[PDB]
Every structure is written in structure tokens, then in C-alpha cells.
Amino acid sequence: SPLLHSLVGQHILSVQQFTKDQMSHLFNVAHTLRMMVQKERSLDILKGKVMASMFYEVSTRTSSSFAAAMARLGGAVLSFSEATSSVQKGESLADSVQTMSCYADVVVLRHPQPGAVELAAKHCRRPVINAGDGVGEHPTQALLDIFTIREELGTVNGMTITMVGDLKHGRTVHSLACLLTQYRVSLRYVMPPTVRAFVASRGTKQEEFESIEEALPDTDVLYMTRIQKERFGSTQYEACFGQFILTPHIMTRAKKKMVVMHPMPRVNEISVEVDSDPRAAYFRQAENGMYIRMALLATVLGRF
Amino acid sequence: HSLVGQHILSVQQFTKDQMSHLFNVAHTLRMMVQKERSLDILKGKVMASMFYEVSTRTSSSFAAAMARLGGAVLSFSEATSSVQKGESLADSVQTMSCYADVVVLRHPQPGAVELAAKHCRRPVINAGDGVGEHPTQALLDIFTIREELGTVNGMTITMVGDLKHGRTVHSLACLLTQYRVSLRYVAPPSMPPTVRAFVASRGTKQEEFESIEEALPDTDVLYMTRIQKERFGYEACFGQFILTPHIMTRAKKKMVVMHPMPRVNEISVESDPRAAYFRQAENGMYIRMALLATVLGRF
Amino acid sequence: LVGQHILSVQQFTKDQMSHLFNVAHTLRMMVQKERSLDILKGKVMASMFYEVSTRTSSSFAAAMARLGGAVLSFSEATSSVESLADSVQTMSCYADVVVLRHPQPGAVELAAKHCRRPVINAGDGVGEHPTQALLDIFTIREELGTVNGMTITMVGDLKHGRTVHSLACLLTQYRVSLRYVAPPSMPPTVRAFVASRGKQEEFESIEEALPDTDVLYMTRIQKEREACFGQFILTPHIMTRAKKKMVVMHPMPRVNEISVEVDSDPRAAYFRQAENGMYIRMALLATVLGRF
């Protein structure tokens, strides 16, 4: 908590704590860490430090990337399977989280419950990096979604952002959508009216649209999301199954200097034949997170 | 002083010259980490983790420990193992003995561990059995006791909670007999009067007490334990063998309270430099580094 | 093989395997003397197993960890389980190889098919298990001096047998007499090609087929379709009518087919078999990643 930019020791719990000078740095780290790997430069950076993974939701992208990330800088990772943990013996979450805070130097916690994370973070001898909460924050996702947006399109400022799919529940879209307000972008929606109020305050446009087929011609980023059939309209359900879907047939009325993103997981929303399409940056999105974590973990531990 | 290759199955096999060394290793390994010195000690060697009880303190520490000296660890999940195709425990344990250089096995069954250990091309470090030992726990409980209070000899030790089932308390309570300490016991009428014949034989004083509120004024270590109201057949049993921060005011100031963990409602959460149960957990990691490293000949 | 997928045993040559073996010994002997192996330092392996195992994956884990690499513990149970490809490719973002094991007919071929990164089979529904077959050879070669000339008694339930179709076929790169021991219930499907390249004969039990046996390859049965269980069993009492210059193997797991008191027997190479896989993976992984 000193001069220059530095998170050294800082917890990483909400996206509110990031600045633009920090993120650009945070991005400048990732490219540099990436490029070391691309050429095979030794990374004894977090050699000897340890990361404690704690995930109570079901994931295999955040955690994996986090695992690859830690393992790439030289560090090690504590598999924590709650299923096979002393929780099957009645122990507090803090009790565990702190216990693990004894054997590790950072923490990566992911909990669905409303703010089980804030709590566990609150008192911790060691730092905690959010990966999910019940309140919907996901700074690492939001964080990585930017590099994609910046890398993919040259700059961030000016872009118009079509966020598509079920957004109400959407816990990733509150993380990015809000943070996007550090840039000059027009937000389109295809959403929780409660925290839509913070965004529009700072002038960040906000307009609702019928489907992709209409909102797409002025689109610089097509941010997609899993819907969930179960929990939809009611009897009727049908077209909204098909509308908020990106087939390769839709993608023909889409800008050519544009990129479509997905946090993932997905199922049938983005048509499998949309895989092989340069404008398809949803898989590279997954790849680039690994470097935010290396960009983050490494910094959050003072080794960069 | 050397266990190189030795199995680590019961607490009976430790000497005082060994443990002091075993402790002198831990501090030295600790202090390397505190400064950030490279530890290519068990670089290359591999540890095979095999746990059939539900834990996340012994195994984790063990994981951190191995990972810190440079080694790697085999995540062995029986759930996803050929057990679901159904093969012998030895079969597996030996199989894993093909891919690793040590082993850390934890089994509830009476002497599933002794067996698996018995025949093994590679060494096995106990972490729990049915019959009913836990040398690494006992081992680490000492450094806490020694580190926390200056010396081990002279201390009076209040072990509180359900002790009958207690598989950690038979590991330390016995071993404590290598020192000059007065053992006190606090239990719901329901310590196993089987293993107890051995400790008091050697004059390691042993006396029963009503609760903490009586046995605490002459207490150097308050060793706490999870009850298990799953054999109550008694909310005084609940609330008596409990350490609130309000009880802690009639407790010595040159004293420390320990817990192997896990816990639930027995110790009030609540900001007491006398609270060495979390640092207890931290200090195990270094027994394992102190042990694993030695048990593998790299120190 | 640099970049090559490893999906069926059809893609191996004898000059490749012998190299593939010459690597394993060399990698082994570095470990025996404790030589540093920064070989796959910085690369990452993504483990993806949908069957229940703890020998292939472990060996694979030890193997990767020994050359300096790291391993992605992928537990489908705690995973987004989205498409299998979706995942397999996703993991292909975070790793440099892949070790996939799927029971389904050709879930593996598929996932492999499109992958930015290489995939090393460990099991499929078609029954192909190149790493096992691969391994089973070094044992056969190491244990008996050479591979050519040996007569191979494969015993147990062979019909379902997914490991025996990996080795039995590949064995055809050598001059060996294949013998078979089964409960009347080997699949006469792949056998269209085994005897094409030239010996195969059926036998009543071990007690008859054993006197001209150089390798006694054993297998878990399936009480699920008695003498058919005690016959195709190797007690220590049977082992006395068995050649002295001969070795008995098992892919494992086992239960009661090989009598526990057959463990401590210098003709017993089924445990060393397990040990020697670790080095095919180091022999393979390392090569498959261009660091050797």
C-alpha cells in the first residue's frame, strides 16, 4: 500500500479496487509474462510460494487457468476438495480458509453464498483473490475480458459492446459491465435494473435490443452468455431459445472488425460451427486469462 | 540420528535426541523459507498421498511441505481410483510405491496402515489409523509446546474434551512421557483406561478434573478436543468442556491453548496471544518438511 | 512424434519403439543416479480421465513431475460438466499435451481430432491402449533379453479385454508364438488381422499351456456371464511347472487371479511392469513435446 502501483498483499474481492494505470500495468505484465513463455524463459518467480485453491462452486476454467498460472511461474497448488475435507467433520469455512492460510501464501476462493467470500477474506493472514461470489463479482473475469477486448480490437475506448443472453442472473456481466465504465464505450444489452443505475451515471450508453440480428451492425464486441432453458418464460420459451444464439448464418450481418466473446461455459448458444471463424475470440479469451492470473498472482505476491 | 528409509507408524520409535534434531531441522527449514532460500532438497523425489479418512490439515501441510522442498505430490483420489473397479489396498499402495519415493497413508480401519506399510518397497509415514496412533500430530504438538513456552519439561498439560475416542491424544499423551510434565484430564464421564496404564506407570502424573474452570489455574498447556455429541445418550457436557474468552481470564498468562483441529463450538472464536491453535497448524508443515526431508536422506 | 497425437497402436514402428525404449532406459538411469531433469520444465500436462483409474494417470503424473513439468488435476465431477471437446480444447488452452481416457466409442478420436495440442490415448471404447502395449514390451524385452522368439501365454477373460488387443496386435512386429487361455465365453473380431502376418493356439488352462511359455500375461476375469475362475488363476503351486527363464505379467488391477503369495517370486514381473510404464510416459511425453 505504497507509492507507484502495487497490490502487494491486497485482497482482490471486487472490481471497484482497480484503476486504469493499474490494469494497463496489469496488462503490460501479462504480455511480458506471456512472451517469456512463448520463447521459454525460466520463471522461478513464485518458486517456493504456494497457492491454496478453494472452490465451492463447480468450475474448470478459472481454477485451471489459476492452476496453470501458478504452476508456470514456478509455484505449487493445493488441491482443496471440500467433498473430501474436514467440512465432512463440521468445521467453519473461515476455520478452513484460515487453516489453509497457514500452508499457503495466496488464496483463490469461489463461493456461491451471499458474500461467504468477503467474510473469509475479511480475516485472513494471507491474501484472497475472488473468483466468484453470490453478489456476482468476478474481477479476474472482468479483468481478462478487457485484454481480449483491447488485444483483439486495438484499443478499448470507442467500442460498442453487445452483451447477449440471460443477464439477470449473470454474475460475470456485472463484473465487466461496471468496470467497462473506465473506458469510452456504448453498452448495448440483449439485465439487473438495480446496478444498471451505477453505469448510466457516468454516461456509459445503455440501450435494450430485440435480438442480435438488430443490435449487431454497430457492434465491436459480442459478449455472449449461457441462458438456462429451465428458468425461462413458461410454455411458449421457444424463439428466445433460438434468438439469443449466434449461428454462423447470423455472423454474416456482423461487423468484420469485431470480435465475439464468451466467458464460458457454453452449450448450444454459440453454434459449434462458429468455432472456426477468425472473429471468434472466445477460446483465446480462455487462454488469455491464464496470463491475467500470472499477471495478478505474481504481482499480488510481490515477485513482480 | 537418522530415519533414512524407516517407516513412521507409531510414536514408540522416536527418541529425544531424534526429536530435538527433528525440531532443530524444522526451525532451520522454517527460517530458510522466512528469508526465502531455495530448497532443491526433494527436487525430483515424489510423494504419494493416500488418505481414506476425511482430512484437510495433515494432507495439506504434507502437500505444502513436499512442494516447499522442491518435490511433487500424487493426488490419489480413491473415489476415482481402481477401487471403483475394486483392487487391493496393498495392491494400490504398492502400485503407488512404484511411482513415488515416500508415502503418507491415512486409514481408519484397525491396522490397514501397519499392513500396507509392512510390505512396501518405499517408506510409509502414518497420518492416522484405528489402533490408534498419529506420530506427526504428536510430533508437532511438541514443537508448539516447546516453542510456545520455552521448554517442555515442567509443564502441566490440561487435555480437555471427549478423550475416549480421541486418536490424537493417545499419540501425544503417551509420548509426553519423554518429559517431566503433570498430565491433567478433562472428560465427560463416558481418557481410555487402556493406554493410560502406560503413561502414569512412569510417574507422569495423571489426575481427573470436573471441568476447565477448576483444572486451569495450574495449566501450562490447554489441549482441546472435539467432543462428538454422537454418543451422549449433557449441554453441561457441551458448555463445560468449552473455552469461551470469558473462561480464559482465570487462565495462566504464561500458558498456551492448543487444538489439533478440526473444531466447531468448543473454542469460542475470540485476539489472544495465548491462542496457539492456529500457529499449531502452521508448525506441522515444518515437522513434515523436518520429517519428509530426513525420511528421504536429503537431510 | 513431435506434435503427433497418440491414439492407436497402429502408428508405431519398430525403429520408433526401440528409440522410444532407448529413451526410457536413459531417462530411468538418470533418475537412478539422480540427475536433474529440467526437460519439461515450464510445459504443462492436462490430465483428463472419465474412466476410473490409478495406474496410467499416476505413472503419467509421476512421469510429468519427474521431467520437471506440472499436471492439471481435471476432476469432471467438479468441472463445468458443456461439450467434451469444449473442455478438452479449453484445457488445450492451459496445457501443452493431453492424456485423455474415455470409455465411449471414439469420444477420444473426436476430442483428439481437433485439438491445438497433442493427445495421448490412455483408453477408449474400441479397446486401444498404446501406452500399456508400449510398456508391456519393455518388460518383455527387459525381462527376457529379447522379444523375438518368445511364446506368449495370455490368460484370463480376453473377450472384453481392452489391454490384450493393444499388445496382442502390436506383438506382430516380432517373431513370437501367441497362445491363448480363456473361458469359452480372445474376440474373434480383431483376430482377422493377428494371424495374417503369421502362431495362435487355444489352450484348456495354464497347467497345459505353461511348459513352452516365455510370458504369462494374466487378466482380470468377470464373474458375470467357478472352475473358469480357479483354472485361470496362478497359485504358487502352479508356478512350479512353469519355465525358469520366464516371466509373468499383469497390466493390473487384479484381485484373486494371481495368488497374493505369488508376489515374492523373481519370475514375478507384474509390479516392475507398473514401474516401467512411468518411463514409457517419460519416454513418450518428453519426445511428444520436443524436449527429447
From Swiss-Prot, chain A:
It is found in: Cytoplasm; Nucleus. The modification Phosphoserine is found at residue 24. This is Multifunctional protein CAD. Activated by MAP kinase (Erk1/2) phosphorylation just prior to the S phase of the cell cycle, when the demand for pyrimidine nucleotides is greatest, and down-regulated as the cells emerge from S phase by protein kinase A (PKA) phosphorylation. GATase (glutamine amidotransferase) and CPSase (carbamoyl phosphate synthase) form together the glutamine-dependent CPSase (GD-CPSase) (EC 6.3.5.5). The gene is CAD. In the N-terminal section; belongs to the CarA family. Carbamoyl phosphate binds at residues 61-62, 110, 138, 141, 264-265. Homohexamer. Interacts with CIPC. Multifunctional protein that encodes the first 3 enzymatic activities of the de novo pyrimidine pathway: carbamoylphosphate synthetase (CPSase; EC 6.3.5.5), aspartate transcarbamylase (ATCase; EC 2.1.3.2) and dihydroorotase (DHOase; EC 3.5.2.3). The CPSase-function is accomplished in 2 steps, by a glutamine-dependent amidotransferase activity (GATase) that binds and cleaves glutamine to produce ammonia, followed by an ammonium-dependent carbamoyl phosphate synthetase, which reacts with the ammonia, hydrogencarbonate and ATP to form carbamoyl phosphate. L-aspartate binds at residues 89, 171, 226. It comes from the Eukaryota. It is linked to Developmental and epileptic encephalopathy 50: A form of epileptic encephalopathy, a heterogeneous group of severe early-onset epilepsies characterized by refractory seizures, neurodevelopmental impairment, and poor prognosis. Development is normal prior to seizure onset, after which cognitive and motor delays become apparent. DEE50 is an autosomal recessive, progressive disease with onset in infancy and favorable response to treatment with oral uridine. Induction: Transcriptionally repressed following hypoxia by HIF1A. Residues 4-304 are annotated as: ATCase (Aspartate transcarbamylase).
